[PDB]
């Protein structure tokens, strides 16, 4: 329904004053631990899911924690409005950690998909604001917003041509307003194909990259790879 | 592994090997009405856990007529040129579940995981379990089986289908350089795809038959009935870990 999303749009517009994209007193000495969160879905079951939270000690990327919970869908899946699909399954996931194995909080968490490369408002960003936590917007692949003047086939034009200088990181500039909005990096060797990274809460973009290096082991970072691991694995335990 | 095993599986495998009927006869493709696969996935953290499947299509068309898969127990570790002893007897069990639950969906011919006449001893698991249990069956292998005894060494096999590849063709005779027999196909009939399959005569059929049947149950690389049979055994062993 078109009424779902003009009360969306109003969300996002909400939220987009709220997300802070400056580190403040956090800093890259400060992360002891990094967590992860994905969600697995199941075709055969369209309402049904399985969300995972994972916490993963910094630099070792050794896992301490591991949950997954069966979840109930609400929503589905829009472009440019995946946040309102998983705030629930994340939330959910927090708060156990938190219970559970308090000591165990991460100072930053990695999550599927974009934050402020999106009305300025991603599914990490606003998933960190409406959580207080501190995210960081990883995306497998590219969003393409026009309005802001980015296409998917000048990203990988100057990528490749960027590739060809011997570079590995790509800023996303917003063609209107001069505005960096993601870093095209690649940390991972036999790589060619780049992940996004954006900030997400409580962190700049240029620390944000640093803490996906530093997870980086495979294209996917370490977190997001044994979120989205786990996640599966128990989603075909229960079919 | 034992001494006295290979010593033993070694007797066995001699004394079926001469068993294996690599001719038509009275066969044909037009007498195909089904077409059976049959493989087992195993577990990685329980050594002795698998399930094994087995599926019955309808030729040509494809189409899924019987599935049944089967939590399996144990008595061998795997070792290249003995697959037969270890899939032998679950193959046997579904042989017996389907022509007892569904008996007139017997296939005409088996499509099974590995080789048959490709082998060292010319008896492979296809042929193999073809022989002991009096079925028709087609060894269809995903990967290149060395035999250094036979003159097949794998960089001198892909070479060569590369260059028959470029010239346009599809089929590749593996001969044995020091029998002079053919041992297998090297086949590739599926659009998007450049590394080949080895097809080989099982039982009961011969090896041009054979490649006739997996062009027909060829959609993509993997045949459909072994991919079916992959397929669900598979994700039945996922229930159980
Ligand atoms: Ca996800
Ligand atoms: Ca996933
Ligand atoms: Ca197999
Ligand atoms: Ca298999």
Known sequence: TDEQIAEWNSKQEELRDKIIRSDGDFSLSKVKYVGGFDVSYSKINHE??????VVLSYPEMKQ??????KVKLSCPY???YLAFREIEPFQQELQLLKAKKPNLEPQVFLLDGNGFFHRRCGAASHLGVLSNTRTIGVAKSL????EDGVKKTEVISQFKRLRKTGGN???IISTEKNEVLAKAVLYAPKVEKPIFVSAGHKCSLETAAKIVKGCTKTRIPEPIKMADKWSRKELKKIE
Do not use: F, H, Q
């Not at 049904?48 to 939270?53: D, E, I, K, Y």
């Not at 301490?64 to 919970?69: E, K």
């Not at 969003?143 to 026009?146: G, K, L, R, T, V």
């Open 169 to 171: 990181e790509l800023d």
């Open 48 to 53: 049904l899911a399985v969300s995972c939270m």
């Open 143 to 146: 969003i393409e917003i026009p």
């Open 78 to 80: 829009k472009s440019s």
């Open 64 to 69: 301490v924690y591991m949950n997954t919970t």
